[PDB]
Design a protein around this ligand. Structure first.
Ligand code: UQ7
Ligand code: HEM
Ligand code: HEM
Ligand code: HEM
Ligand code: HEM
Ligand code: HEM
Ligand code: UQ5
Ligand code: UQ5
Ligand code: UQ5
Ligand code: FES
Lengths: 57, 116, 387, 68, 153, 33, 28, 109, 387, 51, 28
């Protein structure tokens, strides 16, 4: 808690790492959340939802 | 002339609108005449007494501060404004008269604009 | 101050020029958000160049391969669709930002003294933007690319003596063909660099006297440094622009264009609806209004002559439309006229659009004809409106 | 350099509220925007809208006249 | 390998179709105004011409086609195709399905593009809120300032 | 006496800032850094 | 102030490399 | 006087060199030899039904052929020559009164 | 003085920057003709850009059309043989002038303080020239072009972990193919504009302190204006260079090249002799003298590292070789060594050229290792040679 | 030989013409440089130092 | 009255240069 907190506002090197980590985790969480809502809104329309998927003849 | 407010009512509306716009910022009409626009205004301004030029500069700083803040002058301050009280037109006209007299007699100008 | 020791690193010779021109340059404190479109235009130029250099790594300027290589970018190149849509929609965004940039100057009389050279350099820049975007639109080699090039390269034929000679030399042959496409690609790579250099001269010319302000008055009493105040102000516009640009790139990537460019070029058939990009429509409408080929080309040239002659017209010493109610009304009529001209350009050449375009073109030219006499009459205002 | 006589008081950016001013005196802001610009908005919208409706009226009459 | 071509060249296509060339359908939904809707309406819009209109021999009437005279015959008839999933192959079902296939063929990147749009417009809106706060925080010292001058009017 | 001269000669601890754009935090409050 | 800063900036550089280049799977 | 005479001699070369280099770039953009070698050919054609228009190809110049009906010929001969922007008669532009053969490229642009 | 009126137009703001930086810039009066190669290199860059832009109007960057488009340039477009030979031989003239320019800086120690940044910017320019000329040589798509691009992109494989992935990323696939040729064309149009900017910064860095002189001494007591004295001296060099250039263009257009590039690229069979352009041969020689993959690439990087570290060595306070007999002698041995390395690169890899190339590479690196030692020992010259 | 270099005859005529013309320009270039510099190269400089 | 002669003299030069750059002897 206080250990990381005092390092972030005191050293710019730590703060820069905090920005990089936030960009990494923040973008991944948004990408995951957007995909979950995309899957929910498109039930049954996916490529793997095809009933005859695997029997061409 | 059609620009006479007393004779033409359209000019009366034009003068009223300009006065109202100027009064909101505490600006005189002669404060809109900038010395960078031409060298005659700069010469006329340089000939004016210091107390007039200092007051012009303070009205301009007040107006630029109001414009930056998205504000107008308070109505109490707006009541004491004199948007059309002149301090430059007479001196500007004299400077233009002197410039034309120099040109008529074939003399070099006292000042020229820098080629940008 | 004797500079024996080294002070702040931004004042060293390594970065003194950048400090005085980008970081500490004094700027009027009352600048509005309408003054942030010059920096946006520079960013749009950077986007166009960066995406264009990477698109040229996959594009083939041959009539037999141009259309297919663009489709190869959209389908096969990893991330190709994004580069193509950021470049196609980027040209439209560039023109939107610049059109707003120009009309900001008209509203505030930014063209007036002592910044006449800034306006004149901008007009040359606008010409470079028009030429650059047009020849780029021929590169996909679609139906509108081919027939768009057939018209503009024929404009030289308005010259009586050497008009046909220039048309053939411009084509590289007797018709629009691979010679025209190959030479248009080389010019489309070179002109953006010339446009970068013209922008640097444009910024340098403005920095000689500084920026104009919404009040249009002397601004030396209240000037602040560009950084950080107008850096963060411009950053707000940059992020808001990115959202607008993203809406087109990801959700409406083809509405700003025409579907006919998705048909491969056919020199035999002709589309029933041959129109330029939306940002060339107002110029196109003025061309179509005049019922004479020679007169139409002269009208297009007269548009740029009127723009170039605007700063040098003897005028009143008041700049801002905030204190010029009559000129303020003229400006809003001109803006509506420019929108009307663009919409007419998309309309077919038939009644009633023919008459409307002629009236619209007449009103556009009236703005530049009425502006000088407003100044001459307006010069007597302080004498008339006494205390 | 311009000679200037002035007194300026400033407050630290970290001692004031930053965003609540956006929605302060909103009725005054709307009234100022409307009352100062209604002529300007009229001069821009009316020629565009009026010309647009006239063209559609012209097209409708021309279309009906050519029918049998 | 690409999908096979039905004709050796354009001239062979025109000779086998009465002089009209069946256009390539890779980008047809993008190459026409309202492409998805227009193709469906054109496919399912073969009907008798209005009174007073005669169609020359070899053409068929279709109001959606410009001019009304199309060189393509009505090809989407009931049971023209056997579906492996068992859905009834009606005229409208086959018309809807082929336009869906044509739409994907013209825009195979749409799903990736739409997913990128939702994520980045949301992220840029958050940055816009921070950008406004950053601008207002820096400018607050200037906007709240009290300026004292000697001038009155 | 001019206002600037009066202000210079008379320090004022009860200073009032313009509040149209920003409303100040109460004096004696910790910084929002 | 010199060794600690060098360690901190090296850590940020390593974090940036893992963030720009994602070597997930190469960690074997 | 002698110095100006001598310096003008080298100025002759400098102007010629500048003219050569500028011209060489300009003429390089003109039509190439392979382009010019494809500017003259001949094509034969047949017949079309009345009231129709067939477009043929020559060298980037579509050619419009229209079989005009007798009613079309009367409509094309009942116009004032003076009102025409380009004064021309119907007969001087046609050999067969039924077959109109024109190049289908607009003279405007 | 009070600038109330307008004096000479050169001192007006429109041309004041050009006047101070070009017409009236203070220049040492004793500069020899060895100081005229900077303007020659600038003129060569302009010639390459102008001829290249017009050549790009006729060139097709496609493996099925690249070779034939160059032959179409030579045979079909009027004066196209001149543009191609001017461009092909212009790259050789550019390197000849820049090589003489670098050696002037070594002889007169122009890299020394206070001109370290000028030398460092020159090294960056030299790297840009090498990359620009190399990728241009791939464009004709001959046998030399294909096998030349194969190994340079393969140089990245010297990196152990990620070396293979960089090679495939540079290729755009798994072999040098149309993807490689198309991206090389885009970069070949862009890098020449980056070279223009780098040369301008190079020029700006030099103008901070002024040019060095043949005596290597303080020159502030005898400076003269660049115009017209060093303009007319540069004009003599320009005409003399034109005669040199004209000889190569009109009478020996293919001597500075290899006939193998007139064979279309064949990915199946490598030529028995495979060498770069002559101006890359000394780098070729150092690469082939190391009997290791990674060692060869490391030595190439060490060449540019040594060129970058030269200005920062603790050196004596005497610049010109005309007063440093030991340094002057070493310079002439280095010049002979660089000539030998270029000749060695043209030779096949076999005895005795392997031993000769190894020794020549050692001598080249010994120059940059001994020069700092000369400075430290030479520091005590004034204290040992007493009057 | 002609098929490989069909422009040789025109190339050689251009070379003789322009190398000859540029040689005249080089002779004029030397006169121009030595005319402008003569005022500097023949000047007499009187200074105060000896050693 | 020498500005007029200056204009006429420069007009001859402009005409002479025009016939020199473009040499339309086969067109006249
Ligand atoms: C229906 O029909 C129409 C369209 O179709 C759909 C349109 O889309 C448009 C819109 C188009 C425009 C608004 C653009 C028109 C404006 C301009 C300026 C034309 C743009 C200009 C060009 C295309 C010309 C391209 C330029 C060149 C070839 C320059 C040539 C010169 C060069 C390369 C250099 C010359 C060389 C020398 C002097 C030698 C020495 C040089 C050195 C550098 C050393 C219109 C109006 C239209 O009615
Ligand atoms: C690529 C195109 C352009 C770029 C990059 C550009 C860039 C800029 C920049 C950065 C500024 C200063 C900041 C600002 O006022 O926004 C500026 C000011 C200005 N520009 Fe542009 N500009 C472009 C096009 C134009 C055009 C086409 C015109 C006019 C036809 C023009 C006229 C002006 C004027 C008059 C100003 C000064 C306005 C003032 O100070 O109030 N510019 N430009
Ligand atoms: C040096 C920088 C530039 C390069 C290398 C470049 C290159 C290209 C290339 C290769 C294409 C064809 C690929 C495609 O069709 O998308 C293209 C298209 C285009 N470029 Fe550029 N370009 C550059 C700058 C610009 C600029 C500054 C503009 C705007 C003025 C512009 C406007 C266009 C347009 C409108 C198209 C056609 C887009 C379309 O409809 O497909 N480009 N450019
Ligand atoms: C479900 C099957 C088909 C679909 C979805 C389809 C789609 C289309 C489309 C979108 C067009 C262009 C519409 C336009 O120009 O606006 C077209 C035109 C045409 N199609 Fe097809 N097509 C199909 C099958 C066929 C078949 C089987 C034939 C011939 C036996 C054919 C012959 C033609 C011809 C000749 C044209 C040109 C019509 C004209 O130019 O008037 N098509 N088709
Ligand atoms: C933007 C400017 C430039 C453009 C547009 C350009 C364009 C081209 C083009 C299209 C070619 C292929 C045609 C041919 O092979 O002759 C080419 C070849 C070449 N360019 Fe450039 N170039 C430029 C600048 C340069 C520069 C600055 C250099 C030297 C550093 C250079 C060196 C070469 C070389 C060596 C070749 C191959 C010559 C050969 O055919 O043997 N180019 N260039
Ligand atoms: C694009 C190619 C280059 C151009 C156009 C260029 C241009 C110039 C010019 C105009 C000067 C001043 C006049 C002169 O001394 O000749 C100069 C000076 C100099 N250049 Fe370059 N240069 C180029 C490449 C290089 C390279 C590759 C180096 C070596 C790394 C270099 C090192 C220097 C040095 C040391 C000076 C100072 C010379 C002195 O004053 O004694 N330059 N350059
Ligand atoms: C007070 O005055 C100022 C303004 O007015 C109020 C401004 O608006 C801005 C902000 C806007 C700028 C700088 C516009 C950008 C500059 C130009 C010339 C427009 C086009 C620029 C392009 C395309 C950049 C490309 C140039 C490059 C890459 C040069 C190479 C250099 C490097 C890679 C480092 C600044 C800094 C400013 O001070
Ligand atoms: C027989 O063998 C050989 C050849 O053959 C005949 C040669 O000719 C050469 C000549 C090559 C030399 C001297 C070195 C060339 C040096 C470099 C750095 C070229 C490498 C650059 C390339 C491939 C293009 C640069 C790519 C970039 C910048 C990527 C673009 C990316 C972005 C913009 C993001 C050598 C040594 C050789 O031994
Ligand atoms: C006393 O100082 C000076 C010198 O000694 C330091 C010189 O040696 C020279 C002569 C040599 C010069 C200027 C070499 C510079 C060459 C460069 C930067 C590369 C090629 C130059 C180009 C492409 C011009 C780019 C510049 C601009 C402004 C863009 C517009 C130009 C064109 C469109 C052509 C000059 C004029 C000079 O004064
Ligand atoms: S090209 Fe036919 S009217 Fe313009």
């Amino acid at each position: 808690f206080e250990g990381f907190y005092k390092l972030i506002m005191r050293r710019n090197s730590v703060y820069v790492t905090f920005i990089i980590a936030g960009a990494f985790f923040g973008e991944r969480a948004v990408d995951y959340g957007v995909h979950k809502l995309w899957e929910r809104n498109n039930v049954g329309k996916r490529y793997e939802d095809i009933s005859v998927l695997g029997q061409r003849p | 002339r059609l620009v006479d407010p007393r004779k033409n009512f359209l000019a009366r509306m034009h003068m009223k609108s300009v006065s109202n716009r100027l009064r909101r910022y505490g600006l005189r009409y002669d404060d809109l005449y900038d010395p960078l626009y031409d060298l005659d205004i700069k010469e006329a301004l340089n000939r004016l007494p210091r107390e007039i030029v200092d007051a012009r500069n303070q009205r301009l700083m007040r107006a630029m501060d109001l414009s930056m803040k998205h504000e107008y002058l308070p109505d109490n301050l707006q009541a004491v404004q004199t948007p059309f009280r002149s301090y430059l037109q007479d001196m500007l006209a004299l400077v233009k008269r002197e410039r034309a007299e120099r040109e008529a007699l074939g003399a070099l100008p006292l000042y020229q604009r820098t080629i940008p | 101050t004797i500079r024996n020791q080294r002070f702040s690193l931004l004042k060293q010779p390594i970065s003194s020029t950048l400090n005085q021109h980008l970081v500490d340059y004094p700027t009027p404190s009352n600048l509005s958000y309408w003054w942030g479109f010059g920096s946006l235009a520079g960013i749009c130029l950077v986007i166009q160049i960066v995406t264009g250099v990477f698109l040229a790594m996959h594009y083939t300027p041959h009539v037999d391969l141009a259309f297919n290589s663009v489709e190869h970018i959209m389908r096969d190149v990893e991330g190709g669709w994004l580069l193509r849509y950021m470049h196609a929609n980027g040209a439209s965004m560039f023109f939107i930002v610049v059109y707003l940039h120009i009309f900001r100057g008209l509203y505030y009389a930014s063209y007036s003294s002592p910044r006449e050279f800034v306006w004149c350099l901008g007009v040359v820049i606008f010409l470079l933007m028009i030429v650059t975007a047009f020849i780029g639109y021929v590169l996909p080699w679609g139906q509108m690319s081919f027939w768009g090039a057939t018209v503009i390269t024929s404009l030289a034929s308005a010259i009586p003596v050497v008009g046909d000679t220039i048309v053939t030399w411009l084509w590289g042959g007797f018709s629009v063909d691979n010679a025209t496409l190959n030479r248009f690609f080389s010019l489309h790579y070179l002109l953006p660099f010339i446009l970068v250099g013209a922008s640097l001269l444009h910024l340098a010319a403005l920095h000689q006297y500084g920026s104009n302000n919404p009040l249009g008055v002397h601004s030396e009493m209240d000037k602040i440094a560009f950084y950080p105040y107008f850096y963060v102000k411009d950053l707000v516009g940059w992020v808001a622009f990115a959202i607008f640009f993203s809406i087109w790139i990801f959700y409406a990537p083809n509405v700003l264009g025409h579907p006919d460019n998705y048909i491969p070029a056919n020199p035999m058939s002709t589309p029933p609806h041959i129109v330029p990009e939306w940002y060339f429509l107002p110029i196109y409408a003025i061309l179509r209004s005049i019922p004479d080929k020679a007169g139409g080309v002269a009208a297009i040239a007269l548009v740029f002559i009127c723009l170039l002659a605007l700063p040098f017209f003897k005028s009143m010493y008041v700049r801002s439309s905030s204190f010029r109610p009559i000129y303020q009304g003229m400006f809003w009529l001109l803006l509506a006229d420019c929108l009307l001209l663009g919409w007419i350009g998309c309309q077919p050449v038939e009644a009633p659009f023919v008459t409307i375009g002629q009236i619209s073109s007449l009103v556009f030219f009236l703005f530049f004809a009425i502006t000088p006499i407003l100044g001459r009459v307006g010069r007597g205002i302080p004498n008339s409106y006494t205390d | 350099p311009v000679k200037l006589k002035a007194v300026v008081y400033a407050l630290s950016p970290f001692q004031q509220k930053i965003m609540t001013g956006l929605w302060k005196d909103l009725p005054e802001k709307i009234h100022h925007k409307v009352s100062e610009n209604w002529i300007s908005a009229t001069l821009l919208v009316t020629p565009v809208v009026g010309t647009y409706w006239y063209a559609q009226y012209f097209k409708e009459q021309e279309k009906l006249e050519h029918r049998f | 390998d690409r999908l096979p071509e039905p004709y050796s060249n354009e001239s062979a296509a025109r000779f086998a179709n009465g002089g009209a060339y069946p256009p390539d359908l890779s980008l047809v939904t993008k190459a026409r105004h309202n492409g998805q809707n227009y193709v469906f309406a054109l496919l399912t819009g073969y009907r008798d011409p209005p009174a007073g209109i005669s169609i020359r021999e070899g053409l068929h009437y279709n109001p959606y086609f410009p001019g009304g005279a199309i060189a393509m015959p009505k090809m989407l008839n009931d049971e023209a195709v056997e579906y492996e999933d068992g859905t009834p192959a009606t005229e409208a079902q086959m018309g809807k399905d082929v336009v869906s296939f044509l739409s994907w063929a013209a825009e195979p990147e749409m799903e990736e593009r739409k997913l990128m749009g939702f994520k980045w417009i949301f992220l840029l809106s958050l940055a816009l809120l921070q950008a406004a706060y950053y601008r207002r925080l820096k400018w607050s010292v200037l906007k709240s300032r009290k300026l004292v001058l000697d001038v009155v009017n | 006496v001019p206002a600037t001269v009066e202000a210079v000669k008379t320090p004022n601890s009860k200073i009032v800032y313009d509040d149209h754009n920003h409303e100040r935090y109460p004096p004696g409050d910790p910084s929002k850094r | 102030i010199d060794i600690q800063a060098a360690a901190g900036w090296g850590i940020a550089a390593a974090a940036g490399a893992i963030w720009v280049v994602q070597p997930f799977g190469w960690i074997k | 006087a002698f110095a100006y005479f001598v310096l003008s001699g080298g100025r002759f070369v400098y102007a010629s060199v500048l003219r050569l280099l500028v011209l060489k770039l300009i003429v390089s953009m003109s039509a190439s030899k392979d382009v010019l070698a494809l500017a003259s050919l001949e094509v034969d054609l047949g017949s079309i039904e009345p009231g129709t228009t067939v477009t043929v190809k020559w060298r980037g110049k579509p050619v419009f052929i229209r079989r005009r009906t007798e009613d079309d010929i009367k409509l094309a001969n009942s116009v004032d020559v003076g009102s025409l922007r380009d004064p021309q008669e119907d007969s001087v532009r046609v050999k067969n009164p039924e077959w109109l053969v024109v190049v289908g490229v607009c003279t405007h642009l």
